[PDB]
Copies of this chain bind each other. A is one copy, B any other.
Amino acid sequence: MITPELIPSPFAAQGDKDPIPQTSSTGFANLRDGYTPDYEISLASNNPQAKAVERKIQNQLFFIATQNAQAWQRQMAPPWFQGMPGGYEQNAEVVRVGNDGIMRRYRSMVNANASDPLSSTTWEEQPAWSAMRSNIPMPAGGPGLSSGGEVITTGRNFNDLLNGTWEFFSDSVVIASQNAPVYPASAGAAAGMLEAKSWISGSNTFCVQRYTDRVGNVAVRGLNAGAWTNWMYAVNVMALQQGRVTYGVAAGPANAYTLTLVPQLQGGLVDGMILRVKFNTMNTGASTINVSGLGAKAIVGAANFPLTGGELGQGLIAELVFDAAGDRWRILAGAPRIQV
């Protein structure tokens, strides 16, 4: 850390200057010999090549040194010079006037790189750090440029979660998060990341966010017309093996032997929902049971007879299904077609 002085203009910027050659003829300046020793010789002594210190050469030498320092201060990188002799070793970094005069860092991939970086595929153009933060499909910590915030101490609420790897740090604190992405019968989300991405179709915004919690359920929700739809939670093979969706314990006191459905039918009931209905006591008769708390259907027999006698009994599991036209509990197992 040493700070040079601001070079406003190189020395002898608008002064007479002469080009310093590489080869010598007489007691003249060079670039390999520089000031010649042999014809260094007494200038006021009538000697053949007797030379004097050259104002033009020394002024241009100072001009060159000051120009290099000035360009170093401003652009931090030598401009790539057209067909410079000697070539470029690979991984060399330069910046030079681009197509528009807009310039970016260029790094060469080949030795003896004689091609101009604007015309070279070997020279690769290197933009800034925002280009990395864009190249990641979702920036860590949301729009936040720094990685800090990618893991969140308090469960990041999903009322504004649209993008970014908002990793969730403490499961207990995420239990308090609203719009919790956990399958039903679970209170709140656990620790884990959210692959969340958002893309704008004009004024409207479409986005989706997926998230695997500690337990393992994969919850993915998408914004619909400016409002997030409730998460979809992956049906795990343990979930299917449990079969909690299609069965419950028997509930309801009279003319109803409903099952408290955990989980209940999301999005209502449409056609032929199958439930292995439990009856800890014998069915009363035409039972208008409120399965899932919203589907209220009256059970009638498959033989168009009431199920009061012998069809449904106590301590029973018997699968009952909807009717599309009837919206009634037709039997799939347990209540038979009685002989008479």
Contact = CB atoms under 8 A, between A and B. Distances in A.
A233 B238 contact: yes
A276 to B, nearest CB: 6
Interface in A316-340: 316-321, 323-326, 330-339
A284 to B, nearest CB: 14
Contacts of A209: 216
Number of copies: 3
Contact of A303 (B131, B264, B280, B336): B336
Nearest to A79: B3
A28 interface: no
Given A169-B201, A199-B193, A147 B128 contact: no
B234 A206 contact: no
Given A107-B128, A147-B135, A229-B214, A239 B240 contact: yes
B272 A244 contact: yes
B276 A321 contact: yes
Contacts of A30: 12, 15
Interface residues of A, number: 202
A301 interface: yes
Nearest to A86: B74
5 contacts: A137-B138, A137-B165, A217-B232, A241-B263, A272-B278
B37 A9 contact: no
A102 B113 CA distance: 13
A177 interface: no
Contacts of A237: 183-184, 232-235, 239, 245, 263, 266
Given A59-B35, A128-B107, A244 B220 contact: no
A236 B182 CA distance: 13
Contact of A323 (B244, B278, B300): B278
Contact of A317 (B126, B134, B323): B323
B232 A238 contact: yes
A76 B76 CA distance: 8
Contact of A241 (B32, B213, B238, B245): B245
B39 A55 contact: yes
A145 B109 CA distance: 15
A261 B278 contact: no
